[PDB]
Design a protein around this nucleic acid. Structure first.
Ligand SMILES: [Zn+2]
Ligand SMILES: [Zn+2]
Ligand SMILES: [Zn+2]
Lengths: 814, 71, 131, 397, 105
RNA sequence: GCGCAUCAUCCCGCGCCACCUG
RNA sequence: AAGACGCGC
């Protein structure tokens, strides 16, 4: 009927149309859902999710509106909990991070809003379902719902399910639930570890292969969730696991090995060492297994065993390194992804534990292999080892072999990846002074890679130069660095944008490593060459050139004429519409250095004229620029211009200058106590009931000044400012409420809680309700912070004939 | 919607909190501050010919139900 | 009607039951000697010059920023316990400046463009003049 | 209009006291805390004189102070709880002659707040954990451990909050290499404010709550809740383990109660009174301070009453069961806020007001001419005060 | 955080570990989003730092490259003596942004 | 449906949270 | 081209 006839229109409005229309439609959906109900609304919403042709955007919007309407409704979704659950199950079973996060949030909201009894009633029957996908999604649902509202409320229920005898399916489901709780909760199951261990023990004893495998997985999950402590609660599981290790084979063997490897770090050093010695024979017997999953499992087990302190370097080297290294270095197993990452992690952990010497000395030869994946793997291991351990263990032979290997690897640059550059940079940084003889070779190779076939490999060459400039400068080869700089200077005419950005980054690095006065290119000609680069449109070149000219202004401002200073300021104003925030921050920094170098008159006049762009993106940037100019220059030479610009009746100009005053007061801090008197008439004018934005800006200025001048005795003007700020509490807009609350908090921390208590005591018991509510919230805000002074600031209340309200202990006289 | 810190604090009033709760909270805070401050406790123990232990014991007993019984 | 205004505020930390303004050392100057309920006796010394006041304020601020109290309590917050501090300079940090290791005291000495010996001389000048 | 603040005389009154080997040597030292000044002073056994060795100001209000040491170590650390919402562990360096901070962990807002920890502090006797508690609704537990570098380490705080409860005193309980145990005089008041009939004062008894510390599970749980016949004041830590049985003594009005977890029967013993009391009989008698002496041969407890009578408390017990508590009158001294019994036959008394004395114990008075009392005697007790006989005054501050 | 009221903090007991910030949030304050006067470090809670969550940005959730800090104003306002200042929500803007990017990308 | 205005709000092109699979 | 908020013809 009419209730349903108003549903599809809103659905088509929110699914089709401009964003304003769908936002408004969502607004009256949220507003009118109190009278709409839940029954027909869900009866119409759910078939939309049941549509096979559902899209990502439609599903996301519908789940969001369902989440909001369910948050609004406390206990009005009880009859449809089962439907919501069974329709969210496909949403959460998906392999999308955002989708599964939204699904788990939905189920948590279901658990919080709805009672446990109805959930149990609609929840029990599907535990013993024959289909496996529904069992998996129901296991995820149990995990999230037990995460909500706490696990102990349903822990005995889980024990009862796991103690089932009718079929092994119920025990499998219960062990899956325990594993899911272990994998999701993390550290929230530590107090309840013993009961879960006892529950999983008898399932482990069970003869069913699936049941014992899932029990081993649950034990491993519990161990990894209780990694720091919990061996005392796990010492009763070791014997069946050892029996399975010594008897079972196949997938069960893999699960038991994973469980024991997870449990090994839990115990002490001696027990872990003995168990690693026991399992090393089986590990060696299993290394050459064709299965990739088992190889990954044994790699993880080996890494965990090696991470423990029970083993020793000599023993591990003489037992496990030769066979593992012989059977775990092949291209066929290197072609994988999970095997790739697991092998990298295992090798780097082993190198950290036992040492890097041999583990790099007998892989530098393999670095020469023509395979690109093998080269990438060995270089990743090398760079991880260099970053983690260090490089103070290399002799001449190993270091020259490593240099030859890295040079050969970089020479055969076939794939497109930055890992090449990262590895080379880490290697050269780790080597330090010991690589100084070889620098001409790298210089020649990088030059040869630079000058060929029209700027394609020049990107990585310039990135490499920028990365290695530090060691290049510390190698005392100043003439070579100057030669590279000047050559790259005439190589500035490249049309390619990414190549130009790499060139700009390399120029930044070379001018940063060495002093600017020693740079061979002409700066007086460099700036006119960089100005067209400033007029470029690509983001990378724009940010690089803006930071470069910021460095120019910071250091090399003496050799730059004021005419081109003003011009590049003009294109800085023009460029302020950049999308990236880093570009805008660098731009306002450039204004700061320029105004520090030259008198803040022309730049200030140009900045003050950019407050009429009809877009707040440029206005805030100009505000920050004006604030930084006033901070880096004399404040008393900027304020009169700010007031003169305020004199115009332009609302945008007034808002900009007020924000500039707020930012300046925030930046200067305690030094600005002398300028408090100069801005009092402006604050009084802004605090007048004319514009909400004016009141917000005035409150922000008051709060910033109060925080800045706190502790220096400036209460005379602060009290007068509060006298006008206070009548702004009665507002409805959230932004002005937040600004007023911040201003009053600053005035409280500056003046003291006594005056705030005096003001808030006027209407704490007012006959009306809204004034009482706002006074109570203000009083709570005051009472939360600096409570120890209100006791002295409390007033005196006369006691009644039935209760005592007078503290007689304070009336004692000595 | 940052009211979590408001609700997670004990000793502050709200919309329909009566006078009795406010006064008993004030008395409890005053007693706790008296106990914390050594100088005021010493002043109290000097005013009456007693000991600091007895004064703090009596102050602890006064924390059971200040301002008479609830109405 | 007419209301007076407070021009100075401080928090000694202990109850004060004595307050007098009389000279202590012959040939000295008037000081505001006070005695507290905890058994401590202190005096208040006015500043005879603006340069000395600026130097003392800079020293106090630098010590507060560089040398925190042992129990991890904010010195400014401790002094502004019940009411904000007003026109009072704490000398406890200035006297404790003589107890730190040489590195930090020398570092703050060039940071103030001064030298530790004359700094200690200036610190002891007030003590030997007003007490 | 600018004044300079100076301090001609430092604070002298003593609010807390503690003793230990703070220099790593066999020489005992005393660390007492003033109102806002922390200073170290030690006596000379050869001459009996006391000289201050270090004096610093902390710019804060000290609410608790006690010392501890790690097992197998030789140096004692200093833990102080100030009005700031953080805990700091100190260490004394004899070479630098100054206190060196070792750790600093923040857990709440600053100031003497009702629900901010810092008022009550407890340390495990073995020296493996420290507990800090608030007046109401807040309790925190920390784990003390030594890494491979022989440096102090601090773990994360533990959640031990209980809503709508009041805590009177917190003190550690010896377990003898078992999990650390903490006992407090926790009591509830939720029903007190919900009864308009005025019966809040009546039918409301204290409880002796016990808290474990499970290292394996890294969590704290309440152990028991035993109602008490009458309100208590403070607890005493009985040296447990191999040297004596574990337990706690409860000090109340005209009575002392011994309690222990398990199947330990309660022991009660009335506090003896003077001969022909000139005070009002209706006034009760409580305890103001206590000390201990964990001698290897035999341990004993010292306590002081409101009027200053010193009672030597001797505990008689079987291998695992307590038999009786034997009280005995030692001497009479001025009322002291804190008392510490030093080694080598020296006793330090930090008087509540006036000068502080340093007596010297000469005769232990084991079964002297004065008869002793016991809990086995059916029904009060009366003793005749005598001048100073066991203690001999040597030096005073 | 400040700009978006939807994001909320876990507000749990502070631990011993130190939070991290990504390159984008290198200088932003964890509360008021300011780049002025970083004084004190930021402590993280045990729940917010476990396994995969280790070395993650406090504000957005990227890889951790720099240590977090508290600004001078936040320290003055006594706001750093509170619970864990880590956002547990994923943000409403991020979901819509990712969905539209996936659709038009 | 019009004209507006605020939050140094987003603008980053794909990311990776225990997993698929005989 | 996007997350929220408030303003009247
Ligand atoms: Zn980030
Ligand atoms: Zn957290
Ligand atoms: Zn901040």
């Amino acid at each position: 009927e009419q209730k349903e006839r108003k549903i599809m229109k809103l659905l088509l409005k929110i699914k089709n149309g401009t964003p304003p229309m769908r936002k408004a439609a969502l607004r009256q959906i949220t507003d009118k859902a109190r009278e709409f109900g839940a029954g027909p609304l869900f009866n119409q919403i759910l078939p939309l999710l049941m549509s096979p042709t559902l899209e990502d955007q439609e599903r996301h919007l519908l789940v969001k509106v369902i989440d909001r309407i369910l948050y609004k409704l406390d206990d009005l979704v009880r009859p449809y909990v089962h439907k919501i659950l069974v329709v969210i199950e496909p949403l959460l079973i998906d392999e999308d991070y955002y989708a599964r996060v939204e699904g788990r949030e939905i189920i948590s909201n279901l658990a919080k809003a709805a009672g446990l009894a109805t959930m149990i009633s609609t929840m029990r029957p599907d535990i013993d379902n024959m289909d496996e996908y529904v069992r998996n999604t129901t296991a995820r649902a149990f995990a999230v719902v037990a995460s909500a509202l706490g696990i102990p409320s349903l822990l005995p229920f889980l024990k009862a399910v796991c103690k089932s005898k009718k079929s092994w399916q119920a025990r499998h489901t219960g062990i899956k639930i325990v594993q899911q709780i272990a994998i999701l909760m993390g550290c929230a199951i530590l107090p309840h570890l013993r009961s879960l261990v006892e529950i999983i023990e008898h399932g482990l004893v069970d003869e069913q292969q699936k049941v014992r495998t899932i029990s081993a997985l649950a034990i491993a999950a519990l161990a990894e969730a209780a990694t720091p402590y919990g061996i005392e609660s796990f010492d009763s599981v070791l014997k069946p696991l050892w029996k399975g290790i010594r008897q079972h084979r196949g997938k069960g063997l893999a699960a038991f090995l994973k469980a024991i490897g997870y449990l090994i770090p839990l115990m002490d050093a001696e027990y872990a060492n003995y168990y690693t010695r026991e399992v090393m024979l089986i590990l060696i017997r299993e290394f050459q297994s064709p299965d990739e999953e088992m190889k990954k499992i044994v790699l993880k087990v080996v890494k965990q065993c090696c991470g423990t302190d029970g083993v020793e370097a000599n023993y591990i080297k003489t037992e496990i390194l030769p066979p593992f290294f012989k059977h775990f270095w092949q291209h066929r197993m290197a072609l994988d992804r999970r095997n790739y990452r697991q092998l990298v992690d295992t090798t780097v952990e082993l190198a950290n534990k036992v040492g890097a010497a041999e583990i790099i000395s007998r892989i530098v030869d393999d670095l020469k292999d023509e395979a690109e994946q093998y080269r990438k793997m060995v270089m990743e291991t090398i760079e991880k080892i260099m970053g983690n351990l260090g490089a103070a263990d290399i002799d001449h032979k190993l270091e020259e072999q490593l240099i030859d290997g890295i040079l050969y690897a970089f020479q055969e640059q076939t794939t497109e990846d930055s890992v090449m550059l990262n590895g080379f940079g880490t290697v050269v940084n780790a080597l330090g002074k010991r690589v100084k003889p070889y620098l001409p070779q790298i210089c020649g190779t990088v030059l040869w890679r630079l000058n060929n076939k029209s700027a394609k490999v020049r990107q990585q060459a310039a990135d490499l130069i920028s990365r290695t400039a530090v060691v290049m400068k510390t190698c005392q080869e100043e003439k070579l660095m100057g030669h590279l700089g000047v050559v790259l200077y005439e190589y500035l005419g490249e049309e390619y944008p990414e190549v130009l950005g790499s060139i700009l980054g390399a120029l930044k690095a070379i001018v940063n490593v060495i002093g600017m006065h020693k740079m061979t290119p002409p700066i007086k000609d460099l700036l006119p060459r960089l100005t067209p680069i400033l007029k470029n449109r690509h983001e990378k070149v724009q940010e690089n050139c803006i930071d470069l000219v910021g460095r120019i202004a910071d250091r090399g401002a003496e050799y730059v004429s004021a005419r081109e200073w003003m011009r590049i300021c003009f294109e800085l104003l023009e460029l302020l519409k950049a999308h990236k925030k880093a570009i805008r921050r660098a731009t306002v920094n450039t204004f700061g250095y320029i105004a520090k170098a030259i008198g803040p008159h022309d730049v200030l006049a140009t900045l003050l004229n950019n407050l009429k762009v009809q877009e707040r993106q440029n206005r805030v940037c100009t505000t920050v620029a004006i604030a930084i100019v006033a901070e880096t220059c004399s404040p008393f030479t900027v304020l009169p211009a700010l007031m003169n610009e305020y004199r115009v009746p332009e609302l945008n100009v007034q808002n900009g200058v007020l924000k500039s005053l707020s930012f300046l007061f925030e930046y200067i801090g305690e030094m600005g106590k002398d300028y408090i008197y100069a801005v009092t008439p402006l604050l009084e004018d802004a605090l007048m009931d004319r514009d909400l934005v004016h009141r917000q800006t005035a409150s922000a200025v008051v709060q910033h000044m109060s925080l800045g001048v706190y502790g220096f005795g400036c209460e005379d003007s602060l009290n007068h400012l509060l006298n006008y700020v206070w009548p702004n509490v009665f507002e409805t807009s959230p932004h002005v409420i937040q600004a007023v609350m911040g201003a009053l908090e600053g005035l409280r921390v500056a003046i003291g809680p006594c005056r705030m208590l005096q003001y808030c005591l006027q209407g704490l018991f007012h006959p009306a309700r809204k004034v009482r509510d706002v006074y109570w919230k203000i009083y709570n805000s005051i009472y939360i912070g600096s409570q120890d002074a209100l006791i002295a600031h409390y007033p005196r209340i006369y006691n009644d004939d039935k209760n005592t309200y007078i503290r007689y202990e304070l009336d004692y006289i000595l | 919607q940052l009211e979590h810190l408001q609700s997670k604090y004990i000793g502050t009033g709200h919309a329909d909190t009566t006078k009795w709760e406010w006064l008993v909270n004030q008395h409890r805070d005053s007693y706790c501050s008296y106990m914390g401050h050594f100088d005021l406790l010493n002043y109290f123990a000097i005013a009456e010919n007693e000991s600091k232990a007895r004064v703090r014991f009596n102050l602890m007993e006064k924390m059971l139900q200040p301002c008479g019984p609830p109405a | 009607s007419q209301k007076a205004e407070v021009i100075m505020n401080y928090h000694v930390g202990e109850t004060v039951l004595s307050l007098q303004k009389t000279t202590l050392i012959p040939g000295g100057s008037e000081s505001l000697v006070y005695t507290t309920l905890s058994g401590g006796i202190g005096i208040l010394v006015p500043f005879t010059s603006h340069e000395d006041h600026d130097f003392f304020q800079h020293v106090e601020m630098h010590l507060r920023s560089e040398h925190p109290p042992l129990c991890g309590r904010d010195h400014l917050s401790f002094r502004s316990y019940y009411f904000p501090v007003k026109n009072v300079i704490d000398g406890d940090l200035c006297e404790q400046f003589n107890s730190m290791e040489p590195n930090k005291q020398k570092n703050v000495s060039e940071e103030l463009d001064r030298t530790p010996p004359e700094v200690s001389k200036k610190l002891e000048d007030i003590r030997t003049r007003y007490a | 209009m600018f004044l300079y603040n100076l301090t001609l005389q430092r604070a002298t009154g003593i609010s807390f006291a503690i003793h230990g080997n703070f220099s790593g040597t066999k020489q005992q030292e005393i660390v007492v805390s003033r109102g806002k000044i922390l200073e170290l002073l030690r006596p000379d056994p050869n001459t009996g004189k006391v000289h201050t060795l270090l004096t610093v100001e902390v710019f804060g209000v000290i609410r608790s102070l006690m010392a501890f040491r790690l097992t197998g170590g030789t140096k004692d650390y200093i833990v102080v709880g100030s009005d700031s919402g953080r805990i700091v562990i100190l260490e004394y360096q004899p070479s630098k002659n100054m206190f060196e901070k070792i750790h600093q962990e923040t857990f709440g807002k600053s100031g003497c707040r009702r629900i901010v920890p810092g008022q009550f502090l407890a340390v495990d006797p073995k020296g493996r954990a420290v507990m800090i508690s608030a007046i109401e609704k807040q309790k925190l537990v920390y784990i003390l451990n030594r890494d491979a570098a022989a440096r102090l380490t601090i773990s994360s705080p533990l959640e031990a909050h209980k809503a709508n409860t009041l805590v009177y005193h917190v003190v550690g309980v010896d377990v003898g290499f078992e999990n650390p145990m903490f006992a407090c005089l926790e009591m509830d008041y939720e029903e007190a404010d919900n009864d308009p009939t005025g019966e809040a004062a009546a039918n409301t008894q204290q409880t002796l709550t016990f808290y474990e510390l499970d290292l394996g599970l890294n969590h704290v749980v309440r152990k028991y809740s035993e109602p008490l016949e009458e309100h208590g004041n403070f607890l005493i830590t009985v040296p447990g383990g191999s040297d004596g049985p574990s337990g706690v003594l409860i000090c109340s009005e005209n009575y002392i109660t011994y309690k222990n977890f398990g199947d330990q029967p309660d022991i009660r013993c009335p506090i003896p009174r003077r001969r022909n009391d000139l005070d009002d009989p209706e006034r009760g008698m409580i305890f103001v301070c206590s000390a201990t002496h964990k001698t290897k041969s035999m341990f004993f407890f010292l306590a002081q009453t409101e009027q200053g009578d010193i009672f030597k408390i001797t505990l008689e017990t079987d291998e695992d069961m307590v038999t009786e508590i034997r009280l005995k009158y030692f001497d009479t001294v001025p009322v002291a806020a804190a008392m510490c019994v030093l080694k080598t036959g020296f006793l330090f008394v930090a008087s509540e007001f006036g000068n502080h004395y340093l007596y010297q114990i000469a005769h232990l008075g084991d079964d002297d001419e004065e008869p002793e009392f016991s809990s086995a005697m059916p029904l009060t007790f009366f003793f005749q005060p005598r001048p100073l006989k066991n203690l001999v005054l040597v030096d005073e501050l | 955080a400040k700009h978006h009221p939807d994001l909320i903090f876990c507000r749990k007991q502070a631990g011993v570990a130190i939070g991290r910030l990504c390159e984008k949030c290198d200088g932003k304050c964890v509360i008021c989003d300011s780049y002025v006067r970083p004084c004190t470090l930021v402590r993280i809670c045990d729940e917010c730092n476990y396994g995969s969550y280790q070395g993650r940005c406090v504000i957005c959730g990227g890889p951790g490259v720099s240590d977090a800090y508290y600004c001078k104003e936040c320290t003055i306002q006594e706001k750093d003596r509170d619970g864990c200042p880590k956002i547990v929500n994923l943000g409403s803007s991020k979901t819509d942004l990712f969905y539209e990017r996936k659709k038009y990308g």
